[PDB]
Design an enzyme around this catalytic site. Sequence first.
Site, PDB file in Angstrom:
ATOM      1  N   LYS B  72       0.839  -1.183   0.000  1.00 51.22           N
ATOM      2  CA  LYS B  72       0.000   0.000   0.000  1.00 51.22           C
ATOM      3  C   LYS B  72       0.877   1.237   0.000  1.00 51.22           C
ATOM      4  O   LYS B  72       0.713   2.139  -0.799  1.00 51.22           O
ATOM      5  CB  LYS B  72      -0.923   0.049   1.214  1.00 51.22           C
ATOM      6  CG  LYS B  72      -2.200  -0.753   1.075  1.00 51.22           C
ATOM      7  CD  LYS B  72      -3.003  -0.791   2.381  1.00 51.22           C
ATOM      8  CE  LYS B  72      -2.543  -1.904   3.302  1.00 51.22           C
ATOM      9  NZ  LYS B  72      -1.191  -1.752   3.914  1.00 51.22           N
ATOM     10  N   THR B  74       4.171   1.874  -0.562  1.00 54.62           N
ATOM     11  CA  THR B  74       4.918   1.931  -1.774  1.00 54.62           C
ATOM     12  C   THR B  74       4.025   2.414  -2.918  1.00 54.62           C
ATOM     13  O   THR B  74       4.285   3.486  -3.462  1.00 54.62           O
ATOM     14  CB  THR B  74       5.524   0.564  -2.012  1.00 54.62           C
ATOM     15  OG1 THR B  74       6.465   0.334  -0.963  1.00 54.62           O
ATOM     16  CG2 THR B  74       6.208   0.484  -3.372  1.00 54.62           C
ATOM     17  N   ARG B  95       0.611   7.721   7.171  1.00 56.03           N
ATOM     18  CA  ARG B  95       0.705   7.592   8.626  1.00 56.03           C
ATOM     19  C   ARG B  95       2.167   7.622   8.995  1.00 56.03           C
ATOM     20  O   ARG B  95       3.014   7.140   8.237  1.00 56.03           O
ATOM     21  CB  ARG B  95       0.096   6.267   9.109  1.00 56.03           C
ATOM     22  CG  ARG B  95      -1.390   6.141   8.884  1.00 56.03           C
ATOM     23  CD  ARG B  95      -1.862   4.750   9.293  1.00 56.03           C
ATOM     24  NE  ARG B  95      -1.435   3.757   8.303  1.00 56.03           N
ATOM     25  CZ  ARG B  95      -1.446   2.443   8.501  1.00 56.03           C
ATOM     26  NH1 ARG B  95      -1.844   1.958   9.686  1.00 56.03           N
ATOM     27  NH2 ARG B  95      -1.015   1.621   7.533  1.00 56.03           N
ATOM     28  N   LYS B 106       8.681  -6.110  10.707  1.00 53.49           N
ATOM     29  CA  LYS B 106       8.066  -5.321   9.621  1.00 53.49           C
ATOM     30  C   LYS B 106       8.948  -4.185   9.046  1.00 53.49           C
ATOM     31  O   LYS B 106       8.860  -3.880   7.861  1.00 53.49           O
ATOM     32  CB  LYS B 106       6.706  -4.749  10.043  1.00 53.49           C
ATOM     33  CG  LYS B 106       5.858  -4.138   8.917  1.00 53.49           C
ATOM     34  CD  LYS B 106       4.797  -5.116   8.387  1.00 53.49           C
ATOM     35  CE  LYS B 106       4.553  -5.025   6.878  1.00 53.49           C
ATOM     36  NZ  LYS B 106       4.338  -3.654   6.320  1.00 53.49           N
ATOM     37  N   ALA B 274      -3.869  -0.830  11.999  1.00 48.64           N
ATOM     38  CA  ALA B 274      -5.273  -1.162  11.676  1.00 48.64           C
ATOM     39  C   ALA B 274      -5.823  -2.441  12.345  1.00 48.64           C
ATOM     40  O   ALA B 274      -7.031  -2.568  12.569  1.00 48.64           O
ATOM     41  CB  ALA B 274      -5.520  -1.166  10.178  1.00 48.64           C
ATOM     42  N   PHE B 302      -3.341  -2.138   6.781  1.00 49.79           N
ATOM     43  CA  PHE B 302      -3.522  -3.543   6.410  1.00 49.79           C
ATOM     44  C   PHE B 302      -4.615  -3.759   5.354  1.00 49.79           C
ATOM     45  O   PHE B 302      -4.793  -2.921   4.472  1.00 49.79           O
ATOM     46  CB  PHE B 302      -3.803  -4.426   7.634  1.00 49.79           C
ATOM     47  CG  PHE B 302      -2.705  -4.433   8.659  1.00 49.79           C
ATOM     48  CD1 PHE B 302      -1.439  -4.911   8.344  1.00 49.79           C
ATOM     49  CD2 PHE B 302      -2.956  -3.988   9.964  1.00 49.79           C
ATOM     50  CE1 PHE B 302      -0.433  -4.921   9.304  1.00 49.79           C
ATOM     51  CE2 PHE B 302      -1.968  -3.987  10.921  1.00 49.79           C
ATOM     52  CZ  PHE B 302      -0.697  -4.455  10.590  1.00 49.79           C
ATOM     53  N   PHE B 382       6.447  -7.620  -8.204  1.00 51.77           N
ATOM     54  CA  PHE B 382       7.589  -7.921  -7.336  1.00 51.77           C
ATOM     55  C   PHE B 382       8.710  -8.495  -8.182  1.00 51.77           C
ATOM     56  O   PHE B 382       8.434  -9.170  -9.181  1.00 51.77           O
ATOM     57  CB  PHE B 382       7.198  -8.908  -6.214  1.00 51.77           C
ATOM     58  CG  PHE B 382       6.784  -8.246  -4.927  1.00 51.77           C
ATOM     59  CD1 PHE B 382       5.545  -7.603  -4.814  1.00 51.77           C
ATOM     60  CD2 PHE B 382       7.629  -8.261  -3.825  1.00 51.77           C
ATOM     61  CE1 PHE B 382       5.162  -6.996  -3.621  1.00 51.77           C
ATOM     62  CE2 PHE B 382       7.258  -7.656  -2.629  1.00 51.77           C
ATOM     63  CZ  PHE B 382       6.023  -7.027  -2.524  1.00 51.77           C
ATOM     64  N   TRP B 410       7.691   0.515  -7.712  1.00 56.16           N
ATOM     65  CA  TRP B 410       8.767   0.101  -6.834  1.00 56.16           C
ATOM     66  C   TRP B 410      10.072   0.210  -7.538  1.00 56.16           C
ATOM     67  O   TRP B 410      11.068   0.666  -6.943  1.00 56.16           O
ATOM     68  CB  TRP B 410       8.573  -1.326  -6.331  1.00 56.16           C
ATOM     69  CG  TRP B 410       9.699  -1.765  -5.422  1.00 56.16           C
ATOM     70  CD1 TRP B 410       9.899  -1.409  -4.091  1.00 56.16           C
ATOM     71  CD2 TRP B 410      10.837  -2.637  -5.754  1.00 56.16           C
ATOM     72  NE1 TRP B 410      11.037  -1.983  -3.588  1.00 56.16           N
ATOM     73  CE2 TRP B 410      11.652  -2.733  -4.526  1.00 56.16           C
ATOM     74  CE3 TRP B 410      11.253  -3.325  -6.899  1.00 56.16           C
ATOM     75  CZ2 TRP B 410      12.818  -3.492  -4.472  1.00 56.16           C
ATOM     76  CZ3 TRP B 410      12.432  -4.076  -6.832  1.00 56.16           C
ATOM     77  CH2 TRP B 410      13.192  -4.163  -5.646  1.00 56.16           C
TER      78      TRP B 410
HETATM   79  N1  LIG Z   1       6.972  -4.252  -5.839  1.00 53.94           N
HETATM   80  C1  LIG Z   1       7.779  -4.465  -4.779  1.00 53.94           C
HETATM   81  N2  LIG Z   1       8.882  -5.212  -4.889  1.00 53.94           N
HETATM   82  C2  LIG Z   1       9.726  -5.457  -3.859  1.00 53.94           C
HETATM   83  N3  LIG Z   1       9.542  -4.967  -2.629  1.00 53.94           N
HETATM   84  C3  LIG Z   1       8.470  -4.184  -2.390  1.00 53.94           C
HETATM   85  C4  LIG Z   1       7.497  -3.876  -3.449  1.00 53.94           C
HETATM   86  N4  LIG Z   1       6.533  -3.084  -2.918  1.00 53.94           N
HETATM   87  C5  LIG Z   1       6.878  -2.918  -1.625  1.00 53.94           C
HETATM   88  N5  LIG Z   1       8.033  -3.560  -1.323  1.00 53.94           N
HETATM   89  C6  LIG Z   1       8.698  -3.635  -0.008  1.00 53.94           C
HETATM   90  O1  LIG Z   1       8.009  -4.609   0.821  1.00 53.94           O
HETATM   91  C7  LIG Z   1       7.501  -3.954   2.002  1.00 53.94           C
HETATM   92  C8  LIG Z   1       5.986  -3.740   1.975  1.00 53.94           C
HETATM   93  O2  LIG Z   1       5.630  -2.544   1.301  1.00 53.94           O
HETATM   94  P1  LIG Z   1       4.702  -1.445   2.023  1.00 53.94           P
HETATM   95  O3  LIG Z   1       4.441  -0.306   1.084  1.00 53.94           O
HETATM   96  O4  LIG Z   1       5.360  -1.159   3.356  1.00 53.94           O
HETATM   97  O5  LIG Z   1       3.349  -2.323   2.173  1.00 53.94           O
HETATM   98  P2  LIG Z   1       2.144  -1.994   3.194  1.00 53.94           P
HETATM   99  O6  LIG Z   1       2.052  -0.507   3.381  1.00 53.94           O
HETATM  100  O7  LIG Z   1       0.914  -2.636   2.559  1.00 53.94           O
HETATM  101  O8  LIG Z   1       2.618  -2.700   4.428  1.00 53.94           O
HETATM  102  C9  LIG Z   1       8.332  -2.686   2.123  1.00 53.94           C
HETATM  103  O9  LIG Z   1       9.598  -3.116   2.629  1.00 53.94           O
HETATM  104  C10 LIG Z   1       8.583  -2.279   0.682  1.00 53.94           C
HETATM  105  O10 LIG Z   1       9.776  -1.501   0.492  1.00 53.94           O
HETATM  106 MG   LIG Z   2       1.689   0.631   4.663  1.00 53.41          MG
END
Ligand SMILES: Nc1ncnc2c1ncn2[C@@H]1O[C@H](COP(=O)(O)OP(=O)(O)O)[C@@H](O)[C@H]1O
Ligand SMILES: [Mg+2]
EC number: 6.3.4.3
Lengths: 557, 557, 557
Positions: B72, B74, B95, B106, B274, B302, B382, B410
Amino acid sequence: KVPSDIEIAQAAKMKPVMELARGLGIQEDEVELYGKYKAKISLDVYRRLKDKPDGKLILVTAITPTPAGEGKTTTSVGLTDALARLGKRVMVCLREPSLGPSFGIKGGAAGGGYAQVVPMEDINLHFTGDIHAVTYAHNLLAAMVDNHLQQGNVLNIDPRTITWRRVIDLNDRALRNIVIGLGGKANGVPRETGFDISVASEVMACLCLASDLMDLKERFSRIVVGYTYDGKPVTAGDLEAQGSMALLMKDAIKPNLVQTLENTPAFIHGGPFANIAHGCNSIIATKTALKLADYVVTEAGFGADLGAEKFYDVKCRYAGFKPDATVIVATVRALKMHGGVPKSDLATENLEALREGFANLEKHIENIGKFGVPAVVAINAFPTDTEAELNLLYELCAKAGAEVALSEVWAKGGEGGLELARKVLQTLESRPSNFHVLYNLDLSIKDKIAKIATEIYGADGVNYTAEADKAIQRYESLGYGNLPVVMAKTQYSFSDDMTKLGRPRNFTITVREVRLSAGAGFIVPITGAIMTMPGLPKRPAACNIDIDADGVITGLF
Amino acid sequence: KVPSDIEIAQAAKMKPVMELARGLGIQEDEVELYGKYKAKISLDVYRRLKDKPDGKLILVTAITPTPAGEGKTTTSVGLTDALARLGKRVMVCLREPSLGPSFGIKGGAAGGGYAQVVPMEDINLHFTGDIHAVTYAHNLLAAMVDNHLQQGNVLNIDPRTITWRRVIDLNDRALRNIVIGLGGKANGVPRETGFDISVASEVMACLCLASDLMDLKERFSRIVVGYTYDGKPVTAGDLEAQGSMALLMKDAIKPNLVQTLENTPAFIHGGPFANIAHGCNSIIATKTALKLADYVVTEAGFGADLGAEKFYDVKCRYAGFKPDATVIVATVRALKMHGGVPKSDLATENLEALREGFANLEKHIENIGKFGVPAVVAINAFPTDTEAELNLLYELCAKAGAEVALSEVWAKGGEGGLELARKVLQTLESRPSNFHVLYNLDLSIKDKIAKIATEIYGADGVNYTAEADKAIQRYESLGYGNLPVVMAKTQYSFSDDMTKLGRPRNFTITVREVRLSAGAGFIVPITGAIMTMPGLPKRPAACNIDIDADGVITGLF
Amino acid sequence: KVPSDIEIAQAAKMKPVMELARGLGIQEDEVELYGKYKAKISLDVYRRLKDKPDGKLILVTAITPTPAGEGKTTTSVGLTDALARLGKRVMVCLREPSLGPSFGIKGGAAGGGYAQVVPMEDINLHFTGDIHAVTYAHNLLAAMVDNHLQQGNVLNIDPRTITWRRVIDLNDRALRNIVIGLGGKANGVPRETGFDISVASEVMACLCLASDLMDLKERFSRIVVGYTYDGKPVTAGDLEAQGSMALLMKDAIKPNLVQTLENTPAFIHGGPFANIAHGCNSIIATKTALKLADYVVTEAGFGADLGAEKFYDVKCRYAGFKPDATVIVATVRALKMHGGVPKSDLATENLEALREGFANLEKHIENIGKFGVPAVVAINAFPTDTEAELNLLYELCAKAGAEVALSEVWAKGGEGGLELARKVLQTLESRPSNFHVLYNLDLSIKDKIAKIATEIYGADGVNYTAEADKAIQRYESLGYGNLPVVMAKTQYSFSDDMTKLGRPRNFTITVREVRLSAGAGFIVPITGAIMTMPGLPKRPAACNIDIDADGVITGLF
Ligand SMILES: Nc1ncnc2c1ncn2[C@@H]1O[C@H](COP(=O)(O)OP(=O)(O)O)[C@@H](O)[C@H]1O
Ligand SMILES: [Mg+2]
Ligand SMILES: Nc1ncnc2c1ncn2[C@@H]1O[C@H](COP(=O)(O)OP(=O)(O)O)[C@@H](O)[C@H]1O
Ligand SMILES: Nc1ncnc2c1ncn2[C@@H]1O[C@H](COP(=O)(O)OP(=O)(O)O)[C@@H](O)[C@H]1O
Ligand SMILES: [Mg+2]
Ligand SMILES: [Mg+2]
């Protein structure tokens, strides 16, 4: 060659105690059997014999002990059996052994070798339920205090000032300091508290100083459990517990008639430790005995600096007793430890160490002399004491100008003590006693503490943590300044420091905390690092204890 | 080929936020710098712009997550940067990451790869002191409650009914359940209590729903801390704490202006989880943003069953907001887990597992549709998602008859999101939104709980431990029946059981305990085994974290 | 009628600190702003100026306080404004006020009346978040210790020997003694612990003694948290926490620039109390200031028996400082108290009482003499002080042979300190100092305790509890006897007993506990009854604190 104490005691041939009871002017209907070989005696006995003369009171005290203990009990039993064998109408009074140490390290308190009190395994375990009755009266009151809190705390107790602890008659170090009352509003009020060993209970103390049940009930009512938010005492009688408590003690008040291996009659009743409580059997048992026998041999807990001092200053004081003689139990093995021999090194001949260690015996002698009671030393001969050692110690007591006799009662029963028994008798008709207390009740709590500290243990003076100063202040201002002092300290030294062997010089007694026994009627200053609940060792005795299909018991000692 | 997120963020080239502030109609004197690259904005901004139109509100929600999280944040950052690159006057609201998880498992909440918010290590750690201010206002009140008790307990609080816990912003499982107040009468009143993680504090909740400081002070005063012996609530305002609490929040009330890697403006403000709190940034930050930008991208915590439901039913409800679009973040790797692939097996091509797992996405779609807000799915690509997997999922969303776009943000920043950014824009001018809440405030607490339970998670009904039934009874009878519901449950499933993957069917939600947030104005039923304080793993991230002589930081993510 | 502190301070007229910094030859890119009026200065300033000459160091200390405090901070600020008004290039160095006492009894530590440092409300609350940074580094170490116990207790830590406590910057007596880790095997390992106030943190100690961030980190790594079962020490280094602890400290390490009401520059950095900790601001702030000004005024906490002593014997020792002069702050009311007058009466004229109470100040004067630093008495005039009272004291300090000046800086600002400033300048021109420490590091721990007790407090000797004995022996045996000593002791007396006023004679100090600060690099004996976490009073200042919609603050003092 000498078999284990439990083998000996399970092979004893016992007289029906209903006999012994009648061999003493005790009516068939003043006996309450617990099997053929144990009974409880009515208090109507002492009441009806109120105005009849007493016999001779003999106290048995000792030097400063090792963990094995130095043989007061063994000796007291021996002495009694020896006197019977010179045809005397004698009885021994003793304390009920605490259950806990039978599973710990010390073991029971029935004696040793051929000087024992039997049925020994009943005596060491549940006996006749006295300690259980103390435990339940004690813990009943505690439950009621906690229920008071739960039921809206009408008396406005500050739960954090509650001094009333709980008791169990085991060595359980995990219950020293606990928080109870947890789980939320349906389940009580959280607070910090803990357990003492049952034999150190003020309830036992009361048993031991009361004269009859109604008095016990009155004393229970005076027991102070806690304080209100603005500092006023709250008593068991405020909580209306003394009736139930008394009820639970209905049979425990009556002393117990057992006997020795040589069939000599024995009272067992009450069992407070001397390091953490007052260290005598009940007044009830000794005043009774003294109406039934001509000679009454009785024991005080641990060394002369603890039990003897307390025997004279608290029990004899409250009872009226005037000890006639005092036997001081000494051992070569201990006097050697006191002169610098390691504990693991005590079975080896060491004559220098017996001259050095002697200081200990010498101070105990001087201290008893202070009460005005003629003393005999008793050399309790141990399996491995040598020829020279036993000879030297004898000569040091006579050189010291003090009556002395070898005692082979452990190995030979009453005929091991005839020598000893005569010297005591010699003493009775030749040196009358002139007993008097160490101190008048008048004095401040602090002066009383200093009298014992300096006159008995030989320290320079007395340290007080601020908690102690407050408590004392509180106890004097509420009007308990008059009560006598039952000191708590280590049995292992004159000092409050257990490592200081012999006659230690120039030290201070540090009083950590002070307790008020308003029901027993004394004050308890806790010194050094001593706990009111002991723990179990690396390998508790309990691991070697067992019974079989036949009732043969091993590992009890 | 893509470097670590901290390498990227320490190599960012940032605009002075005083610029960005002015690039938005924010006066020089409504900015309060915290260095060149972080500021706090006055609430005079939203006040003076009171009567001006809003922009378009876009929410970003997701599917049911793995422990890594599904993107989310990202995505939200990416989406915002992409929209800027189509020349739009956009802002992202987010947030503040909790400090605790940066040292746990996390990590932070700044985004990922080339979609991040910078200065990332300020954002993840102390940032501008908001969470610290929550922690100190929260723990201040707790101290005052405990001091009340000590100072004679005038209000007659039953300390065993105190619901007010303490907070710290760390993952500290050892502080879940504690007894405090020990040591005796000088040191407080013993009681059972514990700590929640700061971001789950009702104080944060208030920050997040208040409109200005005076309102925050009013809300603080309504916070309920405990109850008297006869059941009457006791509030922070009874204890006169709201003034100091407010004082401690004097700066925390103002939202924080940072920016993205591509210099797009960003608000960060508030950070409740959340699963255990309401999962949105502050109302203050989003209403402000919407007066300053045309498009405002914002995130809920979440999955859609937690954050989205709460975003719509609590925040949007209290604010007046009418979400215009909703983006649903989906990943192949997670949809695969949801179809039966082990966590240690997720980097391997598995196309069947992506058809099976899809159920999860499908329910989240249906659930958002329930609020009357047009959705786009976003496929967060990913590193190891294959060619076919990414193709299949696309086709399932269109086959499912739902807007969809691949998102390479990303790895490629804002230009990874142009496709996505257009579809959202497409949506805005083509499908107007018709948002409405899931339930009216009228209903019983129990009906409200059942609406979420069945409409959103899909259980059959709702179990209540007796503690829950009492609490609810108490909350309805005191007049808090009207408040909305912030459910606590696991983020890892629709169920309250974390092991039940996908779209689990025919189960029950067990409500264990119910809390009252009278200040935030909601009710929190705790379901399943969820804790309000998380723990650290076998190897906490903290062991790999470091900084050097140059300020180069490793191991933060 | 001087208005309340808060009206004065809110009405202040400040300069941007950016100007203030340029006028000390600090570069733009070495200033990090926190508003227009607070900054953090780079450590690069001191480093680059390494070889330039240091200004004059002036210590401000005091007599034994009343609870309200006798004016050290009020005087340090006054003195500094007074110097500035004599056309001098001068800086004040202060400690950040602890947060909790703003809500307690004492209040903040920004000064008083027309001699304050500003922005007050910030300086007293969150300031720039240094204390929070301390709080989180300390508490993360504690969380990692507990987590280690939970994840297999791999290092074999004995949980019951853990000396590392938690911290929080409030007056919370309920957190003094607590039980944590309850709730079962999923919720940690039960253990006894508690909280100290954050400013008394070892983490705070290190910040205050370190030279740079890599130094801080190294210190962190050597902090002993507790022991294995067989007695080996276990450090933060063993748990690999020092990295993350340093990250959290990345900005805390830089000192803070503010100013006075009269716009004189001010460093505020580090908060430790002088009763339970080492009581001086950071070396960093002091050494840096010595490069930028010709005169650096700096304060030590509470009386000279604590603050000065520690400033001299541990701060100056470790920093390579040689203090140039020393102000002793003294009042009529505190001296009257010391001469027997009850607190409720200190308003009323009593020359006689003042004559007797002089004893206190005399001893402090003597004590400063033992250091080789010339002294000026500052008589800090209070509104209640009569004419004849200020004259008597002046005449007494002259007769005692001490340089003295009346001070009216509370009521008049810097122009009420000209006489005082004059005398100080006079002392620096004519009378160089021959500063020497009070003891060597060669000495043993008890040697160093006995010197401070003997020579400074005027104690006859020192007493140790068994636990104090053991900890001392533990520390010698482990390689730390070499450390200097930071005594914890009541501020209200030379003695460790808070009611022994004036110049108590023939008394002994009692050390009841000894902490090891292996990373700060000192030893902390706790004496008397002093707690390391204070309490809130019957009526907290919190109850009287408020802020309105205009940001107008009341009650904060
Ligand atoms: N497309 C992606 N490929 C690799 N890593 C990612 C990707 N999107 C997010 N991440 C990494 O994985 C984790 C989860 O992303 P995040 O935005 O924190 O998700 P959420 O806000 O839903 O928890 C973070 O460490 C982020 O840097
Ligand atoms: Mg998040
Ligand atoms: N002379 C002796 N030889 C060997 N063991 C003995 C002797 N006297 C006593 N014991 C044993 O050593 C212990 C201590 O004796 P006891 O009478 O209990 O001493 P006290 O009453 O002073 O503690 C008991 O186990 C006892 O059986
Ligand atoms: N001359 C004075 N007249 C009235 N109040 C004063 C005076 N000097 C100080 N105060 C106030 O008394 C308190 C103590 O002063 P302070 O500088 O904090 O002393 P210290 O730093 O030694 O504690 C503060 O509230 C201060 O504002
Ligand atoms: Mg015995
Ligand atoms: Mg001060």
